[PDB]
Design a protein around this ligand. Structure first.
Ligand SMILES: *[C@@H]1O[C@H](CO)[C@@H](O)[C@H](O)[C@H]1NC(C)=O
Ligand SMILES: *[C@@H]1O[C@H](CO)[C@@H](O)[C@H](O)[C@H]1NC(C)=O
Ligand SMILES: *[C@@H]1O[C@H](CO)[C@@H](O)[C@H](O)[C@H]1NC(C)=O
Ligand SMILES: *[C@@H]1O[C@H](CO)[C@@H](O)[C@H](O)[C@H]1NC(C)=O
Ligand SMILES: *[C@@H]1O[C@H](CO)[C@@H](O)[C@H](O)[C@H]1NC(C)=O
Ligand SMILES: *[C@@H]1O[C@H](CO)[C@@H](O)[C@H](O)[C@H]1NC(C)=O
Ligand SMILES: *[C@@H]1O[C@H](CO)[C@@H](O)[C@H](O)[C@H]1NC(C)=O
Ligand SMILES: *[C@@H]1O[C@H](CO)[C@@H](O)[C@H](O)[C@H]1NC(C)=O
Ligand SMILES: *[C@@H]1O[C@H](CO)[C@@H](O)[C@H](O)[C@H]1NC(C)=O
Ligand SMILES: *[C@@H]1O[C@H](CO)[C@@H](O)[C@H](O)[C@H]1NC(C)=O
Ligand SMILES: [Cl-]
Ligand SMILES: [Cl-]
Ligand SMILES: [Cl-]
Ligand SMILES: [Cl-]
Ligand SMILES: [Cl-]
Ligand SMILES: [Cl-]
Lengths: 367, 371
């Protein structure tokens, strides 16, 4: 009866409980004959020192094969995984994030021991790419954050725009923390195109919306295309009517992602302990300066795993650990109410019977 | 020929060249017939995402043996090495700290590729213990911030007090960054002990200094014994006359450490290349998830290295993580002006000629102890 520990850092005590269930439920699902999956976990810490310290003292110390990182889906939490990733990445222990959508985790270096059940915001540009053409606009204005996250959605959208009739036109970028995006929009206003795509924080989207309206870029022939987040929080409070944003279906549904992540990890642990040339994970974090050799192997099996019937539906991973084929519900601001006017899944936009109102009030697609 | 690369993250463009010259000088001093030291460096980055990325794209990408980390010595930059230590720790490349004194880096098991030519703030408790040896304080209230830093200072002082017939008369901890301390200091004032040891951030120190001056804990009987930081910035603007604080000699001196680090990294890299089974450091960051097995070795070489005639004293690193063992200087607040009233060698507190006015303008030494 081989005991295999699985660690998680989660939001609440009830989620710790939800994890303990989902694990030993998936334990009976697979078969407790050969291996028996064990759940050990800790409540999340917002203080990234105290957090990194907990991953050693509470998780890695008790022989863990992989860690799940969860936290409140708030914009001043979306980085509580960085310490966990760095600490566990030290020994090559795969970290399975399930809330955070920050693109820095999907980079080709730094977070090499990381994968997630939810796509980064930079992938919302794959929807915008389909959106363009479905509604036949193909000359756009683009403004991104000029922090990593912003350029990550620019670099992507513009890659898809290559090889294609549609071109970038003019890419503009602002300093992340600014009030005063006036002279930047002022320059965009006199430009050719009037379908604006935005990538910003909740409060930064708010600042451009606020200043866009003050410069009369808010209505008529203008189209505003954003993602989720640019229609969350204060961004919603100051958004122009007729803006098109997105929302990741099941994105904030933490109980779902605990269920699916335990799904793939259980499924991939059995897959792993079949190879029979594997080492046990280190119980270290104390003068232990060596990795476990079968670390990255487990990580490769992890992110090449295929797992349909998931509660977030058909969960498989990226070239570098991102969720593949995720469902975004297309949103639209009609009279201060976000109404589902479409739905993107994997690829392709599929609108419903309900009609879109465009920025300014006038129905019927602008140019 | 044979080129050996050394990385560095430093404060300015002119500190970068300061580093490059120190590497060139280390070659002209060492052998340099077999191996020739080289200098690749980047400037420091506040934003921790951009710093981690720079360590990969600029430093690790240039096949680096060890990375030096410096930065402005502001209380806002003291954490800048965490992304460097994590990113380079990922491959077991040794990171050498020059300016940060945060105690978290000294920890067992969080930063295992980290070195520093400067001791942590928690080590100031070694100085306070000696301050109590001289000046016979045997009854103390010790208030520390209830974070890792404050707790690190109380754990080390309590250890030192344990192996002696003593402990803190009472230990008090406040929530880092609170603006109400009035309550805590109330139960402190009614105690027997009258010498107060504080371990707080520079802004937290000011909060307690005025909450203390108000409940009347500044005059006469009291002794205020703190460390650097509790006498820096907003603290010291609000610190009571007669407060005694520490100041790490050549702590804020970048060029002095840029030199000494290059010195010991040069001294140790020669030692390493003297050995059998040495593998080259990782070429790049991208899609690379193996370490270099000699990384841990090289770090153990670095830590057991000795270096006399630094500029900053005798350079050597202890076992715990690694931290220098060298001189501090005792400062006293007189007429709102910090004047040196003593100096601490590696071991003993040794008073100077200059006389020392205690809290509340008092001329002669108090004893704490209720009076
Ligand atoms: C299994 O998990 C429990 C907590 O759920 C933990 O206390 C125990 O140590 C784990 N088993 C092993 C063998 O470590
Ligand atoms: C900042 O905004 C002010 C008024 O809102 C304006 O006068 C100034 O030109 C703006 N500059 C930039 C760079 O946005
Ligand atoms: C603002 O410009 C838009 C053109 O997009 C137009 O609908 C509206 O009449 C303008 N209003 C003013 C006051 O200039
Ligand atoms: C989480 O997911 C469930 C379905 O699995 C659904 O009721 C809802 O969207 C979320 N509810 C809670 C309580 O998290
Ligand atoms: C939505 O995605 C599915 C499965 O990934 C794909 O086959 C299909 O093209 C999309 N929807 C429609 C209506 O075709
Ligand atoms: C040596 O360092 C310089 C920068 O000072 C760097 O550009 C060069 O590529 C390095 N040479 C080797 C062989 O690594
Ligand atoms: C909070 O502070 C005010 C004065 O600063 C005081 O009236 C009150 O007693 C304090 N309470 C606590 C718990 O510090
Ligand atoms: C008040 O303050 C002075 C110095 O600030 C001090 O000597 C005295 O003991 C304190 N207490 C009273 C009751 O005055
Ligand atoms: C650093 O040490 C040097 C001697 O190397 C000394 O002259 C100076 O005080 C320090 N540097 C600065 C900039 O103060
Ligand atoms: C001061 O310096 C050294 C430590 O480096 C030590 O040998 C000596 O005993 C110390 N104190 C005195 C009073 O000499
Ligand atoms: Cl700007
Ligand atoms: Cl206009
Ligand atoms: Cl920066
Ligand atoms: Cl408090
Ligand atoms: Cl009183
Ligand atoms: Cl010391």
């Amino acid at each position: 009866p081989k005991i295999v520990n699985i660690g998680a850092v989660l939001s609440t005590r009830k989620h710790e409980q939800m994890f303990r269930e989902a694990v030993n439920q998936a334990n009976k699902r697979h078969g407790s004959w050969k291996i028996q999956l064990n759940a050990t976990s800790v409540t999340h810490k917002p203080n990234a020192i105290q957090m990194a310290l907990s991953v050693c003292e509470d998780l890695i110390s008790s022989q863990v094969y992989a860690i799940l990182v969860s936290h409140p889906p708030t914009p001043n939490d979306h980085f509580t995984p960085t310490p966990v990733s760095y600490t566990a990445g030290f020994y090559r222990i795969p970290v399975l994030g399930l809330t955070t959508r920050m693109s820095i985790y999907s980079d080709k270096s730094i977070h090499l021991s990381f994968l997630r059940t939810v796509p980064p915001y930079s992938h919302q540009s794959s929807v915008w790419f389909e959106m363009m053409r479905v509604y036949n606009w193909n000359h756009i204005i683009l403004l991104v954050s000029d922090d990593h996250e912003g350029r990550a959605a620019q670099k992507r959208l513009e890659t898809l725009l290559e090889e294609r009739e549609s071109k970038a036109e003019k890419v503009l970028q602002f300093d992340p923390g600014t009030k005063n995006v006036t002279a930047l929009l002022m320059e965009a206003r006199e430009l050719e195109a009037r379908v604006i795509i935005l990538s910003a924080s909740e409060d930064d989207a708010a600042t451009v919306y606020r200043a866009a309206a003050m410069l009369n870029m808010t209505g008529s022939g203008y189209v505003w295309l954003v993602g989720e987040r640019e229609i969350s929080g204060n961004a919603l409070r100051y958004a122009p009517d007729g803006i098109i944003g997105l929302q990741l279906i099941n994105g904030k549904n933490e109980s779902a992602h605990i269920s699916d992540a335990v799904g793939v990890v259980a499924q991939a642990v059995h897959e792993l302990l079949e190879k029979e040339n594997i080492t046990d994970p280190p119980r270290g974090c104390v003068g232990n300066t060596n990795i476990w050799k079968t670390g990255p192997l487990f990580k490769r099996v992890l992110m090449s795993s295929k797992y349909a019937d998931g509660v977030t539906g058909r969960v498989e991973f990226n070239e570098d650990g991102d969720r593949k084929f995720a469902n975004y519900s297309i949103m639209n601001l009609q009279n201060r109410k976000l109404v589902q006017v479409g739905i993107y899944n994997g690829t392709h936009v599929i609108p419903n019977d309900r009609k879109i109102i465009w920025p300014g009030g006038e129905t019927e697609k602008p140019r």
